[PDB]
């Protein structure tokens, strides 16, 4: 009739992996123990210089790790002689990850001496009309319970409400804010998380810019934009996630700041004097994520990625992984009293300068299965149609051309050695692959292979079978 229908269908996408036959060769890797000691509210800076003393690194902002893995294609192996570069390729698939959080319990305590607060509104105790001048208070807060983790192999997409349409393309005033329109963009390391007021920008969305704890008074806040990644017909943005989260209202409070909103006043029959006047309606709930418990860990636990949950079966492309972690239960603050100098005949608040630190621990334990790719000319035709770039990077076909063409003469320096001629002063640039910042994790020398050794290893080896078990554990009775 229309007809239309789409007709019927035009083209359609086959599974990513359904010709990739896994091999019995495994390799293994681990992590030494990554370390940062940051400060959660603000990077503590040098007092006459731009550059950090303590960086803002915390579990309350996204921890995005770029993990870059060995070339599997050319890699150390014990017996291979099947391999034909044109009719087969190799690729890593990681068959498990555990992530050790070596930090003890302890949340990220954050607060502002000047948090925007007018009156109590939970049970309340007074009335007030429109706001006076200067109603902010010293209040501190714990952020809502949020733990998630996601594993991908291409940076993942966040959403946030950004700064949308202007004041002139609507009829919304300056003092009422340009509209909040959901602007989607990739999650970057050092980006703040969802705050319990929604996940939004707060740089240009707080003109007071001291409504909330210091950390979130600037920068974008994101929430993972699961709908785009999972409706993706390739699903390389992610392919594994899990989360446990909750929030509750500690207490309702009202913002300070004059109503700019439109309250029709002829929807209540007038009081007398004070109750004929109109209060602030600028309610905000304060979130809480209190009661930490160690049966609420989504961490610390192996997740065998024999298959993924995406539309990608976890088989790497570009040989890299992205691991985004928020952990609010581990982001522990520390206390101690330190004297600036000795002069204490008594305790003095003067002399004893308290200073908080934050300790952030990460360790990543990996077990990799090697996989082969069966390829023929017809299959390849399809592989390029999905992603040109994967074949071109592997370049066991193809060509981009080998090279060639020259290597020489000669670069750089030029001269070397002895020389130190001129020094030579630069000479830019060579040669970076970044566009986003990421906490680099090199795995290209952490490679090992044993599964009778390494704890993570052993649980995988037992789960399988002979050779070898018992090699423990197992239990861990009772």
């Amino acid at each position: 009739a229309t007809v239309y229908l789409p007709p019927v269908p035009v083209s359609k996408v086959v599974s990513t992996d359904e010709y990739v036959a896994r091999t019995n060769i495994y390799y293994h890797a681990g992590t030494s123990r990554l370390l940062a000691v940051g400060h959660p509210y603000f990077p503590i800076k040098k007092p006459n210089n731009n550059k950090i003393l303590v960086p803002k690194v915390s579990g309350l902002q996204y921890r995005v790790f770029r993990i870059h893995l060995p070339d599997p294609n050319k890699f150390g192996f014990p017996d291979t002689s099947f391999y034909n570069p044109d009719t087969q390729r190799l690729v890593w698939a990681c068959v498990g990850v555990e992530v050790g959080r070596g930090q003890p319990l302890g949340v990220g305590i954050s607060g502002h001496p000047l948090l925007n607060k007018l009156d109590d509104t939970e049970n309340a105790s007074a009335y007030a009309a429109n706001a006076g001048v200067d109603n902010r208070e010293c209040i501190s807060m714990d952020y809502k319970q949020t733990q998630l983790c996601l594993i991908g192999c291409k940076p993942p997409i966040g959403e946030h409400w950004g700064k949308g349409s202007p004041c002139t393309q609507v009829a919304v005033q300056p003092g009422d804010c340009p509209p909040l329109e959901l602007i989607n963009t990739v999650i970057q390391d050092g980006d703040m998380v969802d705050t319990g007021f929604g996940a939004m920008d707060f740089t240009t969305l707080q003109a007071n810019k001291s409504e909330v704890p210091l950390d979130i008074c600037t920068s974008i806040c994101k929430y993972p934009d699961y709908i785009k990644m999972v409706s993706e017909p390739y699903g390389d943005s992610l392919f594994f996630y899990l989360r446990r989260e909750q929030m509750f209202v500690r207490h309702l409070f009202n913002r300070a700041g004059t109503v700019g909103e439109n309250v029709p006043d002829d929807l209540y029959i007038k009081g007398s004097g004070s109750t004929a006047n109109l209060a602030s309606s600028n309610y905000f709930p304060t979130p809480s994520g209190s009661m930490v418990t160690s049966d609420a860990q989504i961490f610390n636990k192996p997740y065998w990625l024999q298959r993924a949950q995406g539309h990608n079966n976890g088989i790497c492309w570009g040989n890299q992984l992205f691991v985004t972690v928020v952990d609010t239960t581990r982001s522990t603050n520390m206390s101690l009293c330190a004297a600036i100098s000795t002069s204490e005949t008594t305790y003095k608040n003067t002399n004893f300068k308290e200073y908080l630190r934050h300790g952030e621990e990460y360790d990543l334990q990996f077990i990799f299965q090697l996989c082969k790719i069966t390829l023929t000319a017809d299959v390849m035709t399809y592989i390029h149609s999905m992603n040109s770039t994967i074949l071109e990077d592997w370049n066991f076909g193809l060509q981009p051309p080998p090279g060639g063409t020259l290597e020489d003469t000669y670069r750089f320096v030029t001269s070397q050695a002895i020389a130190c001629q001129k020094h030579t002063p630069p000479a830019p640039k060579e040669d970076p692959l970044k566009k986003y910042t990421f906490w680099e994790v090199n795995l290209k020398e952490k490679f090992s292979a044993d599964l009778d050794q390494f704890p993570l290893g052993r649980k995988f080896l037992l789960q399988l079978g002979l050779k070898a078990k018992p090699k423990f554990t197992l239990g861990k009775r009772k």
């Epitope: 959901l182 602007i183 050092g190 920008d201 740089t203 920068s219």
Partner: antibody, heavy 115, light 114 residues
């Protein structure tokens, strides 16, 4: 603000003060015009403080922002005669509806002569 | 860096004529993954600073006359003025904001015949 005559090898610090809009909400950017009349990207800095420079000035020019006073800076060092140009301060805009970027506003420019 | 090549270097037309001008990039400005083109066009009148015309390859900035249309995809882009007016004499630039360094074309100078 801040251009003028400077000898080769010297240093110079340019400033750009914003007005009429929310400075903290926009990326700011430096663009120069050499006598040949073609625009050349000088440096950019993200709202989060990540700097970006081309090889022509990387290691010599530094871009920075004062978020409190709303001032954009461009510290130049080891100036070369080839750096002679009109330098422009400019904003950047992100358009979420199309996921793109442009330079919506820029100043009158200040002239820098290395001679 | 991505080299932006504009053509012709200049052209002269009378009031009412249609003009087209080329901007070709040395690398693709089409992000395969989302199919967006990262291209903007600017207009610099004599004695003035460049004004934004087109961005995201084909999106016209508010206040720009509808006679200016930007088109193209990938590496080959065009700016068309459907009917040139006397006030359109200027140097037209194109600029890629796909990757760093952010780079500009050489410009096309439009002059008026009378």
């Amino acid at each position: 603000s801040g251009g003028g005559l400077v000898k080769p090898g010297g240093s110079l610090k340019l400033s750009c003060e914003a007005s009429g809009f929310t400075f903290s909400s926009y990326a700011m950017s430096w663009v120069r015009q050499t006598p040949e009349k073609r625009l050349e990207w000088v440096a950019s800095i993200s709202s989060g403080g990540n700097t970006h420079y081309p090889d022509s000035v990387k290691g010599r020019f530094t871009i920075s922002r004062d978020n409190a006073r709303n001032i954009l800076y461009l510290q130049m060092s080891s100036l070369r005669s080839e750096d002679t140009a009109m330098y422009y301060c400019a904003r950047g805009l992100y358009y979420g509806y199309d996921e793109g970027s442009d330079f919506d506003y820029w100043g009158q420019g200040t002239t820098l002569t290395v001679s | 860096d991505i080299v932006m090549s504009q053509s012709p270097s200049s052209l002269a037309v009378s009031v009412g004529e249609k003009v087209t001008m080329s901007c070709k990039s040395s690398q693709s400005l089409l992000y395969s993954n989302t199919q967006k083109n990262y291209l903007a066009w600017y207009q610099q009148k004599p004695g003035q600073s460049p004004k934004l015309l087109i961005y995201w390859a084909s999106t016209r900035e508010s206040g720009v006359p509808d006679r200016f249309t930007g088109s193209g995809s990938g590496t080959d882009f065009t700016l068309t003025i459907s009917s040139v007016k006397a006030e359109d004499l200027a140097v037209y630039y194109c600029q890629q904001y796909y990757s760093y360094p952010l780079t500009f074309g050489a410009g096309t100078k439009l002059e008026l015949k009378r």
